[PDB]
């Protein structure tokens, strides 16, 4: 871009280039889905998605209250989310199985399936990530008021 640098890109809307702190190798990040991929990547009316939610609290209620179901911190929740992403990408675990096993959403019962929806129904961050995903693609950690999600667009 600058006179002393190689020129470059497209990067469809939402994408940006970055560097691996570990290898110095370039990779691409989508700031809407928060997904990362090595390959240069280079909207629809309804989409169907499945997700895995990891809740966290920051609440701090008085002694009189019953113990809360969710006690982990946001940091701990993000660590769990990143670990699941790694296991799914490495083919070590299947998205559906992990969702059924660890998702804190009531949809865990349906292997994480939320069904088909249009814009206006889901929390904005979730909605934006879902519609920016390609069919069959998975998001990176997505933050909403419900907690941290991993989203898989199935349709």
């Amino acid at each position: 871009g600058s006179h002393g640098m190689a020129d470059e890109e497209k990067l469809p809307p939402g994408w940006e280039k970055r560097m691996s702190r570990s290898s110095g190798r370039v990779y691409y990040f989508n700031h809407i889905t928060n997904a990362s991929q090595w390959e240069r990547p280079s909207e629809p009316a309804r989409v169907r998605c499945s997700h895995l939610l990891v809740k966290h609290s920051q609440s701090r209620r008085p002694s009189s209250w019953r113990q809360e179901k969710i006690t982990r911190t946001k940091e701990e929740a993000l660590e769990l989310i990143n670990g699941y992403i790694q296991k799914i990408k490495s083919g070590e675990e299947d998205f559906e199985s992990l969702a059924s096993q660890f998702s804190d959403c009531s949809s865990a019962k349906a292997r994480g399936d939320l069904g088909a929806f249009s814009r206006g129904q889901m929390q904005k961050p979730f909605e934006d990530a879902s519609f920016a995903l390609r069919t069959g693609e998975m998001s990176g950690p997505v933050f909403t008021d419900s907690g941290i999600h991993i989203i898989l667009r199935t349709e």
Binding site: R18, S20, R21, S22, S23, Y27, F29, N34, S36, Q37, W38, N82, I85, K89, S90, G140, P141, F143
Partner: peptide, 7 residues
């Protein structure tokens, strides 16, 4: 949010 490398 600082992103994690793809692998």
């Amino acid at each position: 949010y600082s992103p994690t490398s793809p692998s």
